[PDB]
Amino acid sequence: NDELLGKVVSVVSATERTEWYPALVISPSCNDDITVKKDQCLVRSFIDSKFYSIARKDIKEVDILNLPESELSTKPGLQKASIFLKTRVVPDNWKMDISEILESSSSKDKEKELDPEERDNFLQQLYKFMEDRGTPINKPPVLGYKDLNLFKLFRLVYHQGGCDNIDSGAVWKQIYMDLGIPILNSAASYNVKTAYRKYLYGFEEYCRSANIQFRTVHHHELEHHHHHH
Numbered sequence: 001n002d003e004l005l006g007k008v009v010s011v012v013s014a015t016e017r018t019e020w021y022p023a024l025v026i027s028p029s030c031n032d033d034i035t036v037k038k039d040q041c042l043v044r045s046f047i048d049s050k051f052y053s054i055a056r057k058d059i060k061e062v063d064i065l066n067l068p069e070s071e072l073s074t075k076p077g078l079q080k081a082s083i084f085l086k087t088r089v090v091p092d093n094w095k096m097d098i099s100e101i102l103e104s105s106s107s108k109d110k111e112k113e114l115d116p117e118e119r120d121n122f123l124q125q126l127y128k129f130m131e132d133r134g135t136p137i138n139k140p141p142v143l144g145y146k147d148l149n150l151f152k153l154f155r156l157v158y159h160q161g162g163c164d165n166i167d168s169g170a171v172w173k174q175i176y177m178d179l180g181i182p183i184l185n186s187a188a189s190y191n192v193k194t195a196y197r198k199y200l201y202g203f204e205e206y207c208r209s210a211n212i213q214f215r216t217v218h219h220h221e222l223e224h225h226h227h228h229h
Contacts, residue, residue, distance in 0.1 A: 001063065009023055023059075088128035153192070162207065
């Protein structure tokens with residue numbers, strides 16, 4: 001059923017396929033202390049361990065919410081999975097207050113074409129996933145004393161080719177500037193880099209590793225603007 005998609009999988013209790021605990025296949029680049037070996041995968045258990053390295057032999061991928069509720073409800077790990085997943089891995093079913101996420105997030109009613117529905121989805125997914133990885137939103141997206149439109153920064157960076165494609169501090173500056181937040185000084189360059197790197201690092205890592213973010217912007221050798229030296 002493909003574990004490697006970065007979805008929820010069953011991590012069994014080594015021998016018991018009966019009792020297992022679901023986890024999410026994630027990038028081991030999110031965890032510096034755990035490191036992945038070729039036979040193992042990096043899974044985040046929403047129910048138990050936030051980062052653990054387990055061999056793919058002990059991992060049987062499954063769509064937890066696809067399984068019968070009688071099965072789920074009898075095994076707490078499977079049940080909570082059903083609960084946890086329905087609110088963060090399925091399209092319509094993603095629900096958290098979009099206004100708690102930013103402020104209001106302008107999700108009142110939508111502008112087609114001009115506004116990407118992906119924004120709301122992304123904010124929602126990131127907020128859910130932020131909490132379950134042990135690096136939750138302890139501070140809301142505000143940057144430079146004002147509301148930080150998280151998806152704008154994502155879109156902006158993505159428009160620069162992606163953060164994997166960002167080599168210049170000028171870009172972090174430019175993305176921060178596009179939000180309309182006063183760049184002030186280099187501390188704000190720090191701010192924006194920190195923001196993207198803590199809030200979006202998971203999706204970033206996955207996005208850049210699975211080749212989603214990649215544009216001609218960073219497909220060059222020489223620059224048109226020689227860097228200040």
